Ligand binder design. Structure first.
Ligand SMILES: C[C@H]1CCC[C@H](O)CCC/C=C/c2cc(O)cc(O)c2C(=O)O1
Ligand SMILES: C[C@H]1CCC[C@H](O)CCC/C=C/c2cc(O)cc(O)c2C(=O)O1
Lengths: 264, 264
């Protein structure tokens, strides 16, 4: 039985969250678009090994839109990590395995470095380190135009699995539509300079497992592979591209349970 | 004026070779398909910055087909390296910068390690280190069936630049047609286990500059990035995928001259 509910933290945010299972805590942090329906299948799968899976829409996005604008403007890994630690406190999750991709990747590594006693271990996927003008220049377009462009970027380039993407259904895509603009204005300019990955030595030794999409063009996260390898951090691949939990749930959920298990 | 000619070495091979310019020697080693017409524009471009550019069809391929079958069966970075040293001796090129992609990549690093006094510096691009069953399974499969399949792999997947690929013209494609089978039977099984990169400490400090295609799926040479990074070897990207000298001559030639100049 999945809990589907809301909970409020004292930084102004009213979070939509979901939760399934009994066991050590695994937390699935969404990517930029902040939409936790993307995890729905994997939540059940991971929970059926013995875990309590929690996930949530991110502040300003989908059903967690009731939040103050500092929460979704000029966003940074550090800020997102603050927010995630606040919803974790509210749900009395003391010790969590965490996953996160893209801005979620940034967020979990910043969790891992900033709050070592709270994070059993962290899985980051395709952590953004470089600015990226095609994305960034959409911020100053009108809402709606942005939605047309970003919707299309997600669909054709970057799911790694376009059928699966579309199959999320009309509701989810209606929520994403409203999300694109807030993301375009809040994330692409400011997330990458915040990357907590410039201090190689702080990564060394940490319980961190880093991945990239197998199908993703080598240029997109070449830097993740260089950085991880210099820092001794475990790195490898998942199938697809930027959303392994949409395109390849079964392998995604396997990878999460299997990696969590290593750090118990 | 380009020299277009042949020369014979005492290991049975009659090489077709080309050469343009005066200066330090830069040698362009073809990829598996062994066909040096692919360099034609770059040969001129590199030569005009003051170098003597040599290139050649590889043994058993295109216009260097008069060669004994041990030169194109059960091929191997070490073998290919001896062959290229032999055509270098015949042409009295005493010191060369070398470039190579794919099996050429394997060949140039074996040159660099085996013959340090002959190699000013080496540029390797997408070095094969894994077996690869879709390729390998073509070996047992009719000369002309293999040419259909491999011609189509090259066209659609892996030029990185399909218009440029086709524009090489019918002549070169007729030569390639005959080449695909020889390659399929001689290269994919045996080149990768010969990869001279399993000794990281031999790479360290050497004048080696390694690249991968920006557009190439991350999985294809993820390992090249790990290895280079562990060995302190210079690594980065060129545009396109597996043939940057077909798809992006101007930036290829720029990369070759600029890199040669660093070691010059
Ligand atoms: C939403 C997700 C979309 C990935 C597909 C993107 O369209 C493909 C480009 C990858 C960019 C990811 C990204 C960059 C950035 O600076 C900040 C971000 O929050 C993200 C990110 O979360 O990208
Ligand atoms: C011919 C060239 C282009 C084919 C790229 C292929 O379409 C992409 C596969 C990349 C590796 C190719 C390759 C593997 C190998 O074991 C030996 C080789 O000589 C090659 C190689 O030369 O690939």
């Amino acid at each position: 039985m999945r809990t589907r509910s809301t909970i409020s933290t004292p930084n102004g945010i009213t979070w939509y969250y979901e939760q399934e299972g009994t066991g050590p805590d695994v937390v699935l942090v969404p990517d930029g678009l902040g939409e936790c329906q993307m995890f729905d299948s994997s939540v059940s799968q991971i929970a059926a090994q013995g875990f309590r899976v929690t996930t949530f829409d991110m502040p300003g996005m989908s059903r967690s839109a009731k939040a103050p604008p500092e929460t979704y403007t000029e966003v940074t890994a550090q800020k997102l990590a603050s927010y995630v630690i606040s919803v974790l406190d509210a749900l009395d999750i003391k010790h969590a395995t965490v996953w996160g991709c893209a801005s979620g990747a940034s967020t979990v590594v910043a969790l891992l470095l900033g709050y070592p006693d709270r994070i059993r271990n962290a899985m980051c996927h395709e952590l953004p380190t470089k600015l990226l003008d095609h994305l960034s220049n959409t911020a100053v377009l009108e809402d709606e135009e942005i939605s047309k462009i970003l919707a299309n970027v997600m669909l054709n380039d970057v799911s790694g699995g376009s059928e699966a993407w579309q199959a999320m259904g009309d509701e989810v895509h209606a929520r994403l539509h409203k999300n694109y603009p807030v993301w375009a204005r809040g994330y692409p300019r400011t997330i990458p300079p915040s990357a907590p990955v410039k201090d190689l030595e702080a990564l060394r030794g940490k319980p961190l497992d880093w991945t990239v999409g197998a199908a993703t063009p080598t240029e997109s996260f070449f830097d993740n592979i260089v950085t991880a390898t210099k820092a001794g951090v475990n790195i490898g691949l998942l199938p697809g591209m930027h959303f392994p939990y949409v395109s390849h749930p079964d392998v995604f959920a396997k990878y999460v349970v299997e990696t969590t298990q290593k750090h118990l």
